Curated annotation (Swiss-Prot):
Membrane-side (Cytoplasmic) residue stretches: 126-172, 219-276, 332-670, 731-784, 827-894, 948-1230
Enzyme class, broadest EC rank: translocase
Extracellular side: 41-104, 194-197, 298-310, 692-709, 916-926
Enzyme Commission number(s) from the entry: 7.6.2.-
Encoding gene per record: ABCB11
Protein name per its UniProtKB record: Bile salt export pump
Positions annotated with a glycan in the UniProt record: 66, 73, 79, 82
First and last residue of the signal peptide: none
Residue numbers of Phosphothreonine PTMs: 543
Binding residues for ATP 1: 412-419
């Protein structure tokens, strides 16, 4: 949507110069990497020429008998027919020259790379600082309707993240893109313009590699969606069971659910296997294509192109490496394009909200300004509806006037637009129709900044800012003096309270500061209103948010010193309007009454008389994890060139011992994958060795032998390609299978154990059903990243390194030690880069936290800022705060630039030193020149591989964290284990109950809501009813009788057996519960009814009897499919009045000895209550029932009752004798 170059719209001249210089330096640096190969070609040509000369000089004196052609004295004044063929080439001098060239290139790369990053990062930081301050300046000027439409929760995200995305888009990423694009262009150009036949030939094979890479890329996304579609077949079961855990526990259906989940994990396992197969196969295919391209390139570059005489070996090597480098760095530019797209997309909202012109805003050009106003204000035909929902009219032809120097009160229903009238007179909105005037002038065309200065409002709910009390009061008026603040506090009745504080007026009083009671906050808000001595005072239900004592105290401050200046007040309670000079009533958004107390007492005064009479979900996480893991595995496609230059850049955690011990059962797959990875690691140094071998053959004098050896090496390349294909595919498949098996096992055990935890474990907010589902789906999958792939990567890197070191030390140990000095730096470059980057990002976010704090404080209560406070102060405060992120950004620029430039330049220094020493070795010791290339390339490639090994940072730690989260679960021993052993069982269950003064407080809930002193007993067959308060007892007795919780103190006696001694499952097998909400399962009606005794089979006749007893048999028979009809989410919606009867049948079918009717008959209508009450009453025949009902005594008049509201029971007996003793039961008939 937004043009990419629009992102730089805030660039200044200094920024333009910085970006231009950075781009120039990036261009020069990018040229360096493919440009160095030109020197390498001539270096290898010199090596080969010297080797040919040296091999010739070993022949035994050809010219010592005859003149012949090319002997030693050809360098001297002798008649050798072919001319100079010796002496003139001093190898050491040439190598000195080339090492000097490499050192110079290294210095240039260092300087240019540093400047590039430094300048680009600095320019981006400056531009985004300016952008953020401008964006905030624009928000604060939006009309409040714009804030009604837009949520603060997303404005904060726009301010924090979206601008960070733009930063990433115009930050160093642009410089890296420029460098890599110029590098690849030069890499291809220096091939084409040195040899075009070979360059064209090796390019012509590129399309197949492109197809392979594109196939892998498409596969990532395709199989992400396929996996998500696959696992949901079990995700639905998991979510269903966990979201309704209490019913499953009550009916003991855990085993069936576990089996159902196990039966469904297979689809996800299968799709994981297939994704692994595909990805491994295509990676192997790409590797095979790479090696076949190598073989073709070398065979063709030899035949008819080098042995025929067109090229020199140096040109061949240079062309090949230049094309490889170009292809590699074209690939590395892809992340920059993704970053550019993300930035271009994210900038749409920011720029549109920056360019938006506000309807009404703080300004001085809005027009007229009055002086010496009477304060008189009036309305005319005002009709208005909130722009967030224009469907509903709030005001309708409002025509009312407030006289000056007096008070006016507003009364009426809350929905009569009572308060909205206030927001219009401080001009939060303009009326849709009509006009509002003050002192004879329309509010529009009157300078808003001046207008809101005359008005002073008392907020409906007090709001204070994170500063001192003195400043919070001074916000009302800037030039207010300290004694003025003291006077305002005294008038507001806050002075005495404030002076009692530990630090008095200077105490911080924000939400982050010392907390205060609501009354004191309202008092200080009133002081803030008063300090500006407003001409018009608005009281928008000040006391509505306070308790009775604070209500009275604040009302005492109000209506006491309020005279001279007009007051417009909305009454929280009607009694307070008695002193108003006038009273205006609001109904259907129009003024009606218009008469003072005596005049509105002309008739009933419905409101006043009435008040006096009455009062006197996992999908996001799973998708992200799947995509991130797929991308992580994609790193193995990396392939550098030999020689040349490297590819610069492509709750506590559990011990790995536990993870591997848990993953033991699938060892053979891991072993096979390890073998595959070992061979794959061996591959790289072997191809470096083959390259060095190729270079050597060009010094062979016998042309036919040279041809034979080159053909042999090409065949070895082909064989290595095939081996790499097969081994890569095998590794991928084996490790994918290991990971999937581990994930399935872990999910099975995790879900199986999750059903064994005590109910209280589910109540914890840390164990929300959404959180549990996310843990089961995502975390169970991430654990494989620490067992399967990690072992393979470790083995791969280890084998690579060991083979490379073996080759290097076998062929030359003196040169290896020289090149080995740079090995640590090459290995640690990438790891240090990544970890420094993430640390800097974390520090930058920590710095942004303060801007987040200030901006959230400003926006969360924009109404207070705009109406009474000052808008400009917050803009300037945020501008001042924005310095810290810029300060951190500058040092990030410096440090990151240095660390990047040094990492780039280290390789060139290594080449310089290594070849400088190799020259000496060739000159003196007599190494074959091929060994120098062999050693250097092998060591460098092993160093790069080892460095890439340490890049496991993003995934390994979180995999261990997930493993720890699962392990803490698996070994947990809940206080009440459904899987516990047998205990205190008996066959003769009688259903006798007895509560012994139980004490209970909920965990994860506040220690209030307590059950205290409950002591009641029920004989078999008698029904007990609980009624009274809506808390502090009643319901919790249901959950204690069932083993959901155990009493904190006291005991519950079931048939004379202590509850804590009875086996949980055996006890729960005899109880039947009904809940106010009849939760059901998506199976058929018959399945739900059969759910009652899932542990055993039952005939259909029992279901018929249960449905008949539940007033359901006839109803279900009327459904299209009868008993087999599907239920719940199937779409066959059934009203609660029917699902309740289904639940009643489910409870009855098991023939429980005890019934728990937890507030049934709470349906939506009286008809449902009538339908279900008969079924409930029939259910209790000959059973011990603990019935709880919200309805009056009509329900519970059947049997004994308890009525208390404090847990303990004092009043107990039949309703008739409860009536006789004049108990609290009378309230049920009063």
């Amino acid at each position: 949507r937004v043009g990419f170059f629009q992102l730089f719209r805030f660039s200044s001249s200094t920024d333009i110069w910085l970006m231009f210089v950075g781009s120039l330096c990036a261009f020069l640096h990018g040229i360096a990497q493919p440009g160095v190969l030109l020197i390498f070609g001539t270096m290898t040509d010199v090596f080969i020429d010297y080797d040919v000369e040296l091999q010739e000089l070993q022949i035994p004196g050809k010219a010592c008998v005859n003149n012949t052609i090319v002997w030693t004295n050809s360098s001297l004044n002798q008649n050798m027919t072919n001319g100079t063929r010796c002496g003139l080439l001093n190898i050491e001098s040439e190598m000195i020259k080339f090492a000097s060239y490499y050192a110079g290139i290294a210095v240039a790369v260092l300087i240019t790379g540093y400047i590039q990053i430094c300048f680009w990062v600095i320019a981006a930081a400056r531009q985004i600082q300016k952008m953020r301050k401008f964006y905030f300046r624009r928000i604060m000027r939006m009309e409040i309707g714009w804030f009604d439409c837009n949520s603060v929760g997303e404005l904060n995200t726009r301010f924090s993240d979206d601008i960070n995305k733009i930063n990433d888009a115009i930050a160093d990423q642009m410089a890296l893109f420029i460098q890599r694009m110029t590098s690849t262009i030069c890499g291809f150009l220096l091939g084409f313009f040195r040899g075009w036949k070979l360059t064209l030939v090796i390019i012509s094979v590129s399309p197949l590699i492109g197809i392979g890479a594109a196939t892998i890329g498409l596969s990532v996304s395709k199989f992400t969606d396929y996996e998500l579609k696959a696992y949901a077949k079990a995700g639905v079961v998991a979510d269903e069971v966990i979201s309704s855990m209490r019913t499953v526990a009550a009916f003991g259906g855990g085993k069936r659910e576990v089996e159902r989940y196990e039966k469904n994990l297979v689809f996800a396992q299968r799709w994981g296997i297939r994704k692994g197969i595909v990805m491994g196969f295509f990676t192997g295919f790409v590797w095979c294509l790479i090696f076949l391209c190598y073989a073709l390139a070398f065979w063709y570059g030899s035949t008819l192109v080098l042995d025929e005489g067109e090229y020199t070996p140096g040109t061949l090597v240079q062309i090949f490496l230049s094309v490889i480098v170009g292809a590699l760095n074209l690939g590395n530019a892809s992340p920059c394009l993704e970053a550019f797209a993300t930035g271009r997309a994210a900038a749409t909202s920011i720029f549109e909200t920056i360019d938006r012109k506000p309807i009404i805003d703080c300004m001085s050009e809005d027009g007229y300004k009055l002086d010496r106003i009477k304060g008189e204000i009036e309305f005319h035909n005002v009709t208005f509806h909130y722009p967030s929902r224009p469907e509903v009219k709030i005001l309708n032809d409002l025509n009312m006037v407030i006289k000056p120097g007096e008070m006016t009160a507003l009364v009426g229903p809350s929905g009569a637009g009572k308060s909205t009238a206030l927001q219009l007179i401080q001009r939060f909105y303009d009326p849709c129709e009509g006009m509002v005037t003050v002192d004879g002038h329309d509010i529009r065309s009157l300078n808003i900044q001046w207008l809101r200065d005359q008005i002073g409002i008392v907020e409906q709910e007090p709001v204070l800012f994170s500063t001192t009390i003195a400043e919070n009061i001074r916000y009302g008026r800037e030039d207010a003096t300290m004694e003025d603040i003291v006077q305002a506090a005294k008038e507001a009745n806050a002075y005495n309270f404030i002076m009692d504080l530990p630090q008095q007026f200077d105490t911080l009083v924000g939400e982050g500061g010392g907390q205060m009671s609501g009354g004191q906050k309202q008092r200080v808000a009133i002081a803030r209103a008063l300090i500006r001595n407003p001409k018009i005072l608005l009281l928008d239900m000040a006391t509505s948010a306070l308790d009775n004592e604070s209500e009275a105290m604040v009302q005492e401050v109000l209506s006491k010193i309020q005279h001279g200046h007009t007051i417009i007040s909305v009454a929280h309670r009607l009694s307070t309007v008695r002193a108003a000079d006038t009273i205006i009533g609001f109904e259907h958004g129009t003024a009606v009454e218009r008469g003072t107390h005596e005049e509105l007492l002309e008739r009933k005064g419905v409101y006043f008389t009435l008040v006096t009479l009455q009062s006197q979900s996992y999908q996001d996480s799973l998708r992200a994890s799947i995509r991130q893991r797929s991308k992580s595995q994609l790193s193995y496609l990396v392939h550098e060139p030999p020689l040349a230059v490297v590819d610069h850049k492509s709750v506590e955690p559990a011990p790995v011992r536990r993870i591997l011990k848990f993953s033991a059962p699938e060892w053979p797959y891991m072993l096979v994958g390890s073998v595959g990875a070992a061979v794959n690691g061996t591959v790289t140094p072997l191809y470096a060795f083959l390259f060095s071998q190729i270079l050597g053959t060009f010094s062979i004098p016998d042309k036919e032998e040279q041809r034979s050896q080159i053909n042999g090496v090409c065949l070895l390349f082909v064989a290595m390609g095939c081996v790499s294909l097969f081994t890569q595919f095998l590794q991928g498949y084996a490790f994918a299978k290991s990971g999937e098996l581990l994930t399935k096992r872990l999910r099975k055990f995790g879900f199986r154990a999750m059903l064994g935890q005590d109910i209280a474990w589910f109540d914890d907010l840390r164990n929300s059903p959404g959180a549990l589902t996310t843990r089961l789906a995502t975390d169970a999958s991430q654990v494989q990243g620490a067992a399967g792939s990690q072992i393979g990567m470790i083995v791969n890197s280890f084998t690579n390194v060991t083979v490379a070191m073996i080759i290097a030390f076998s062929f030359s140990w003196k040169l290896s030690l020289v090149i080995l000095c740079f090995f640590p730096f090459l290995a640690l470059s990438g790891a240090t880069q990544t970890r420094m980057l993430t640390g800097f990002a974390s520090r930058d976010k920590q710095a942004l936290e303060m801007v987040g704090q200030i901006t959230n404080e400003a926006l969360s209560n924009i109404r207070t800022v705009a109406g009474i406070g000052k808008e400009r102060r917050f803009i300037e405060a945020l501008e001042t705060e924005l310095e810290k992120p810029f300060k951190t950004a500058i040092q990030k620029a410096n440090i990151y630039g240095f660390c990047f430039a040094f990492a780039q330049c280290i390789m060139f220094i290594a080449n310089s030193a290594s070849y400088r020493y190799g020259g000496y070795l060739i000159s003196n010791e007599g190494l074959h020149f091929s060994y120098v290339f062999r050693v250097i390339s092998a060591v460098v490639l092993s160093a790069t591989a080892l460095g890439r090994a340490f890049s496991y940072t993003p995934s390994y730690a979180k995999a261990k964290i997930s493993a720890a989260r699962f392990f803490q679960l698996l070994d947990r021993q809940p206080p009440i284990s459904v899987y516990n052993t047998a205990g205190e069982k008996w066959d003769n269950f009688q259903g006798k109950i007895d509560f012994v003064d139980c004490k209970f407080t909920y965990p994860s809930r506040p220690d209030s809501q307590v059950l205290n002193g409950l002591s009641v007993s029920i004989s078999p067959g008698q029904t007990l009813a609980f009624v009274g308060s809506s808390g502090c007892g009643k319901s919790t007795s249901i959950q204690l009788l069932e083993r959901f919780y155990d009493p904190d103190q006291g005991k519950v006696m079931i048939d004379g057996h202590d509850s804590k001694k009875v086996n949980v499952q055996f006890l729960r097998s005899n109880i039947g519960i009904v809940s106010q909400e009849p939760v059901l399962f998506a199976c058929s009606i018959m399945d739900n009814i059969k759910y009652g005794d899932n542990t055993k089979e039952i005939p259909m006749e029992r279901v018929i009897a249960a449905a008949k007893q539940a007033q359901l048999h006839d109803f279900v028979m009327s459904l299209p499919e009868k008993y087999e009809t599907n239920v719940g989410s199937q779409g066959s919606q059934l009203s609660r009045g029917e699902k309740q009867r289904i639940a009643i049948a489910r409870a009855i079918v098991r023939d429980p000895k005890i019934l728990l009717l937890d507030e049934a008959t709470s349906a939506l209508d009286t008809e449902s209550e009538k339908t279900v009450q008969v079924a409930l009453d029939k259910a209790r025949e000959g059973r011990t029932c603990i019935v709880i009902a919200h309805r009056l005594s009509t329900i519970q008049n059947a049997d004994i009752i308890a009525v208390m509201a404090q847990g303990v029971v004092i009043e107990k007996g039949t309703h008739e004798e409860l009536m006789a003793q004049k108990g609290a039961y009378y309230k049920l008939v009063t």
